[PDB]
Design a protein around this ligand. Structure first.
Ligand SMILES: *[C@@H]1O[C@H](CO)[C@@H](O[C@@H]2O[C@H](CO)[C@@H](O[C@@H]3O[C@H](CO)[C@@H](O)[C@H](O)[C@@H]3O)[C@H](O)[C@H]2NC(C)=O)[C@H](O)[C@H]1NC(C)=O
Ligand code: NAG
Lengths: 48, 174
């Protein structure tokens, strides 16, 4: 399975059309807040 | 010690001097003890503290490593990113070490001059009145009170009056 992704700007439409081998999306992801973050690699756990 | 004030002339520090950095030891009829002059140690404190902040202030802008990931089919870019990130760290860790190494020498040499110049002005005030022993000691002639020691300490040593009694003491030993 080769999954794809794209960013849908506000007031824009995305059109799907297929006759087989299609994997329709079920839930979409809103982008509420944009800030600064990093995807760090570690085996540590939460420490409170 | 390029200026030679530390060791050289004075090779022994004073453990009893805790009030300040630079001071004078008086051994006269009115007891003995250690005393400090503020104009010398305050400038050293301000100068060193300014230097300490300057290292922190200058190092505010530095490279900040960030995480980037690649998909196992683009390894030239991953190698390029890896060599760039650690290359910048190698450059910046050399600047920090070199800066610390040089400024350590500055502080030690800066302290040499302050105590050296402190000695220079006392010799320049006492001049013929005292004799230079070799370890920073001055042995003056006049039999004045402890206030004259304070007069040496505030850098206000009037010469003429003390010259006549001292020159009467330069002719009795000769
Ligand atoms: C997704 O839906 C929105 C809203 O349903 C579409 O917005 C459209 O935006 C245009 C430009 O503002 C509207 O045209 C104007 O409409 C007003 C009110 O009807 C009219 O008085 C003006 O003369 C002008 O025609 C358009 O009506 C509006 N569509 C609506 C309200 O249904 C948007 O275009 C849609 N996305 C795509 C990709 O089509
Ligand atoms: C200390 O030196 C200053 C220099 O102006 C002088 O005014 C003051 O009288 C000195 N202290 C004493 C106790 O003489």
């Amino acid at each position: 399975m080769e999954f794809f992704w794209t960013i849908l700007k506000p007031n824009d439409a995305i059109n799907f059309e297929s006759n087989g081998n299609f994997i329709a999306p079920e839930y979409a992801y809103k982008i509420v807040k944009k800030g600064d973050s990093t995807i760090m690699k570690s085996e540590l756990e939460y420490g409170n | 010690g390029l200026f030679g004030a530390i060791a050289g002339f004075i090779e022994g520090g004073w453990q009893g001097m805790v009030d300040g950095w630079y001071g004078y030891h008086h051994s006269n009829e009115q007891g003995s003890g250690y005393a400090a002059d503020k104009e010398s140690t305050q400038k050293a404190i301000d100068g060193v503290t300014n230097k300490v902040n300057s290292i922190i202030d200058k190092m505010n802008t530095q490279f900040e490593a960030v995480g980037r990931e690649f998909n196992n089919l683009e390894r030239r870019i991953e190698n390029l990113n890896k060599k760039m990130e650690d290359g910048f760290l190698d450059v910046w860790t050399y600047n920090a070490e070199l800066l610390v190494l040089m400024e350590n020498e500055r502080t030690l040499d800066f302290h040499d001059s302050n105590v050296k110049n402190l000695y220079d002005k006392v010799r320049l005030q006492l001049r013929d009145n005292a004799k230079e022993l070799g370890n920073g000691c001055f042995e003056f002639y006049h039999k004045c009170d402890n206030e004259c020691m304070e007069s040496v300490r505030n850098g206000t040593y009037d010469y003429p009056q003390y010259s006549e009694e001292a020159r009467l003491k330069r002719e009795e030993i000769s």
